[PDB]
Enzyme design. Structure first.
Site, PDB file in Angstrom:
ATOM      1  N   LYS A   1      -3.016 -10.070  -8.708  1.00 36.59           N
ATOM      2  CA  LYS A   1      -3.915  -9.658  -7.457  1.00 36.59           C
ATOM      3  C   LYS A   1      -5.054  -8.625  -8.065  1.00 36.59           C
ATOM      4  O   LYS A   1      -4.590  -7.687  -8.809  1.00 36.59           O
ATOM      5  CB  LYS A   1      -3.093  -8.962  -6.443  1.00 36.59           C
ATOM      6  CG  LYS A   1      -4.026  -8.737  -5.243  1.00 36.59           C
ATOM      7  CD  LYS A   1      -3.214  -7.582  -4.126  1.00 36.59           C
ATOM      8  CE  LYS A   1      -3.484  -7.793  -2.811  1.00 36.59           C
ATOM      9  NZ  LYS A   1      -3.598  -6.500  -2.197  1.00 36.59           N
TER      10      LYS A   1
ATOM     11  N   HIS B   1      -4.364  -3.552   7.071  1.00 42.02           N
ATOM     12  CA  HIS B   1      -5.391  -3.522   6.018  1.00 42.02           C
ATOM     13  C   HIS B   1      -5.925  -2.259   5.372  1.00 42.02           C
ATOM     14  O   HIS B   1      -5.883  -1.528   6.230  1.00 42.02           O
ATOM     15  CB  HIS B   1      -6.394  -4.460   6.635  1.00 42.02           C
ATOM     16  CG  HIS B   1      -6.452  -5.815   6.787  1.00 42.02           C
ATOM     17  ND1 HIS B   1      -6.876  -6.108   8.130  1.00 42.02           N
ATOM     18  CD2 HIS B   1      -5.749  -6.890   6.422  1.00 42.02           C
ATOM     19  CE1 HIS B   1      -6.460  -7.282   8.270  1.00 42.02           C
ATOM     20  NE2 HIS B   1      -5.755  -8.004   7.163  1.00 42.02           N
ATOM     21  N   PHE B   2      -5.738  -2.253   4.042  1.00 46.02           N
ATOM     22  CA  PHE B   2      -6.457  -1.171   3.436  1.00 46.02           C
ATOM     23  C   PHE B   2      -7.768  -1.648   3.156  1.00 46.02           C
ATOM     24  O   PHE B   2      -8.029  -2.705   2.564  1.00 46.02           O
ATOM     25  CB  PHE B   2      -5.774  -0.681   1.977  1.00 46.02           C
ATOM     26  CG  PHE B   2      -6.056   0.341   1.408  1.00 46.02           C
ATOM     27  CD1 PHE B   2      -5.494   1.607   1.391  1.00 46.02           C
ATOM     28  CD2 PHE B   2      -7.316   0.613   0.637  1.00 46.02           C
ATOM     29  CE1 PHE B   2      -5.715   2.952   0.877  1.00 46.02           C
ATOM     30  CE2 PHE B   2      -7.947   1.755   0.028  1.00 46.02           C
ATOM     31  CZ  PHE B   2      -6.903   2.755   0.244  1.00 46.02           C
ATOM     32  N   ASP B   3      -8.779  -0.995   4.008  1.00 43.40           N
ATOM     33  CA  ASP B   3     -10.162  -1.364   3.693  1.00 43.40           C
ATOM     34  C   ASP B   3     -10.870  -0.720   2.494  1.00 43.40           C
ATOM     35  O   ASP B   3     -11.652  -1.406   1.733  1.00 43.40           O
ATOM     36  CB  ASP B   3     -11.050  -0.833   5.017  1.00 43.40           C
ATOM     37  CG  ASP B   3     -12.450  -1.637   5.365  1.00 43.40           C
ATOM     38  OD1 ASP B   3     -12.295  -2.952   5.152  1.00 43.40           O
ATOM     39  OD2 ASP B   3     -13.331  -1.133   5.328  1.00 43.40           O
TER      40      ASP B   3
ATOM     41  N   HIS C   1       0.765  -1.409   0.009  1.00 44.19           N
ATOM     42  CA  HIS C   1       0.086  -0.073  -0.031  1.00 44.19           C
ATOM     43  C   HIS C   1       0.708   1.259  -0.080  1.00 44.19           C
ATOM     44  O   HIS C   1       0.219   2.442  -0.440  1.00 44.19           O
ATOM     45  CB  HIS C   1      -1.163  -0.138   1.083  1.00 44.19           C
ATOM     46  CG  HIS C   1      -1.907  -1.388   0.859  1.00 44.19           C
ATOM     47  ND1 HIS C   1      -2.918  -1.295  -0.231  1.00 44.19           N
ATOM     48  CD2 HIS C   1      -2.398  -2.325   1.650  1.00 44.19           C
ATOM     49  CE1 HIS C   1      -3.529  -2.608  -0.255  1.00 44.19           C
ATOM     50  NE2 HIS C   1      -3.239  -3.103   1.047  1.00 44.19           N
TER      51      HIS C   1
ATOM     52  N   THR D   1      -4.856  -0.664  -3.787  1.00 40.90           N
ATOM     53  CA  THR D   1      -4.666   0.748  -3.589  1.00 40.90           C
ATOM     54  C   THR D   1      -3.207   1.297  -3.374  1.00 40.90           C
ATOM     55  O   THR D   1      -2.748   0.381  -2.233  1.00 40.90           O
ATOM     56  CB  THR D   1      -5.590   1.498  -2.924  1.00 40.90           C
ATOM     57  OG1 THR D   1      -6.691   1.042  -3.663  1.00 40.90           O
ATOM     58  CG2 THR D   1      -5.555   2.983  -2.700  1.00 40.90           C
TER      59      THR D   1
END
Ligand SMILES: [C-]#N
Ligand SMILES: [Cl-]
Ligand SMILES: [Cl-]
Ligand SMILES: [Cl-]
Length: 124
Positions: A41, A119-121, A12, A45
């Site tokens: 993947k 984590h990128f939500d 990220h 982002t």
């Protein structure tokens, strides 16, 4: 075994550029961050801000993760981001991504001590 934090960083963080300045950005970065090794993947982002600015979001706006968990935070300000998403003509091991640059609030799940993004939500 990669830590959750180190994996968040690899997947990220792109503090080296202020924005995706070409449509090839996602192809290049998805490969060089090792997100096309096993499979393509699907979505990823990148954040064009300092690691410190992204870590800081963990003590900003507490919001629900879309899995209903409560350890997610929304950035108070917008941030330079790039959305990478496979196109219809993407087939491992020839991964092809659409590059969408944008300025949006990021939402990250934070964990651990130190309490850092894992984590990128989403971005809004
Ligand atoms: C996706 N966490
Ligand atoms: Cl770490
Ligand atoms: Cl790696
Ligand atoms: Cl993502």
């Amino acid at each position: 075994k990669e830590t959750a934090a180190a994996k968040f960083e690899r997947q990220h963080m792109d503090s080296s550029t202020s924005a995706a300045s070409s449509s090839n950005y996602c192809n290049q970065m998805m490969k060089s961050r090792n997100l096309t090794k096993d499979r393509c993947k699907p979505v990823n982002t990148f954040v064009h801000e300092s690691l410190a600015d992204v870590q800081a979001v963990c003590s900003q706006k507490n919001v629900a993760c879309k899995n209903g968990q409560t350890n997610c935070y929304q950035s108070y300000s917008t941030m330079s981001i790039t959305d990478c998403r496979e196109t219809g003509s993407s087939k491992y091991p020839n991964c092809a991504y659409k590059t969408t640059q944008a300025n949006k609030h990021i939402i990250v799940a934070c964990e651990g001590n130190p309490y850092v993004p894992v984590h990128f939500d989403a971005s809004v």
